[PDB]
Amino acid sequence: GIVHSDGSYPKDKFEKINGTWYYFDSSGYMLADRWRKHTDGNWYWFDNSGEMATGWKKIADKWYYFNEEGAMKTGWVKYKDTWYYLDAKEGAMVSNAFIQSADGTGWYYLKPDGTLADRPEFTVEPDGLITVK
Amino acid sequence: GSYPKDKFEKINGTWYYFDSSGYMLADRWRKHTDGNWYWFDNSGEMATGWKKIADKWYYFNEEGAMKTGWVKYKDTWYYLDAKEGAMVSNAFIQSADGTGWYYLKPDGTLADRPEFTVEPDGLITVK
Ligand SMILES: C[N+](C)(C)CCO
Ligand SMILES: C[N+](C)(C)CCO
Ligand SMILES: C[N+](C)(C)CCO
Ligand SMILES: C[N+](C)(C)CCO
Ligand SMILES: C[N+](C)(C)CCO
Ligand SMILES: C[N+](C)(C)CCO
Numbered sequence: 043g044i045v046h047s048d049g050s051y052p053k054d055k056f057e058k059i060n061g062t063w064y065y066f067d068s069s070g071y072m073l074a075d076r077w078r079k080h081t082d083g084n085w086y087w088f089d090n091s092g093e094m095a096t097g098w099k100k101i102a103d104k105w106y107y108f109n110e111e112g113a114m115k116t117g118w119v120k121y122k123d124t125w126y127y128l129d130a131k132e133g134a135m136v137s138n139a140f141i142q143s144a145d146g147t148g149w150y151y152l153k154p155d156g157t158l159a160d161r162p163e164f165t166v167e168p169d170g171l172i173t174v175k
Numbered sequence: 176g177s178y179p180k181d182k183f184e185k186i187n188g189t190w191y192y193f194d195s196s197g198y199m200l201a202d203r204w205r206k207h208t209d210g211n212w213y214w215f216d217n218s219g220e221m222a223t224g225w226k227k228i229a230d231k232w233y234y235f236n237e238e239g240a241m242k243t244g245w246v247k248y249k250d251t252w253y254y255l256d257a258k259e260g261a262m263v264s265n266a267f268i269q270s271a272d273g274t275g276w277y278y279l280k281p282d283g284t285l286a287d288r289p290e291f292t293v294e295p296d297g298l299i300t301v302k
């Protein structure tokens with residue numbers, strides 16, 4: 043936290059203390075373990091120490107990705123040169139789902155662990171039940 | 176008594192739904208008090224069977240209630256979105272036990288022998 047000469051402190055704004063970003067509410071306390079869709083329309087999240095999230099974060103048993111300046115991203119993002127799909131709506135990594143290509147031609151499959159499958163092996167049964175491996 | 180209000184009513188053997196004014200509903204969905212959706216055509220007859228409403232397809236049971244999920248028609252399955260009740264097509268739907276997927280074709284019919292072509296970058300195309 044910061045306190046000025048007049049004794050006032052920052053309220054409802056972002057502040058970078060010693061090279062780390064934090065957010066203080068309209069009461070002067072920093073958000074901790076909390077989201078906030080900033081005035082800039084981007085979503086942010088702060089952990090136990092109130093530090094602004096960067097990169098991947100497991101939040102409430104789900105995974106989100108944050109750019110280097112704090113905003114949550116959606117769509118495809120590569121990590122360890124392998125792709126992941128983040129729900130364009132809610133923002134959490136998808137898994138075991140068929141996400142349709144951008145050229146409407148087809149689909150991209152993401153395995154139960156979230157990693158895109160670029161060697162998907164299909165197995166169909168008599169009634170047509172697809173089973174992906 | 177002589178002025179039907181907020182109630183369904185069978186007239187000339189046909190179901191109609193009466194709004195608060197005593198006028199039939201016409202070209203309107205109307206989630207009833209039983210948790211089901213109902214549609215009435217231009218005459219105000221209660222929808223039954225299949226109905227292409229706003230270029231989207233729907234299926235209602237012989238009682239008027241709109242169906243969702245897997246409905247079998249002419250020994251060929253079709254899947255109805257549990258969300259808005261419309262007919263899914265060229266999409267994959269999870270099997271009821273989360274063990275696999277079923278593919279619904281452009282025309283809406285379940286494919287029993289879908290063929291897959293996996294391109295270099297992993298992209299999948301269905302036929
Ligand atoms: C952060 N990752 C998306 C790479 C892990 C979830 O599997
Ligand atoms: C909190 N901000 C996103 C405005 C700073 C990072 O550049
Ligand atoms: C939808 N989000 C995951 C971005 C946060 C809402 O609290
Ligand atoms: C999709 N269904 C499982 C209902 C058809 C195969 O029996
Ligand atoms: C399934 N129908 C034959 C009733 C029409 C929708 O394509
Ligand atoms: C079959 N309906 C539900 C439309 C009649 C009940 O009054």
Ligand SMILES: C[N+](C)(C)CCO
Nearest residue numbers: 204212241258259260
């Ligand atoms: C989902 N329904 C189409 C049944 C409601 C009207 O929007």
Ligand SMILES: C[N+](C)(C)CCO
Nearest residue numbers: 118125150296297298
């Ligand atoms: C990121 N994409 C899924 C669009 C490329 C496939 O490798």
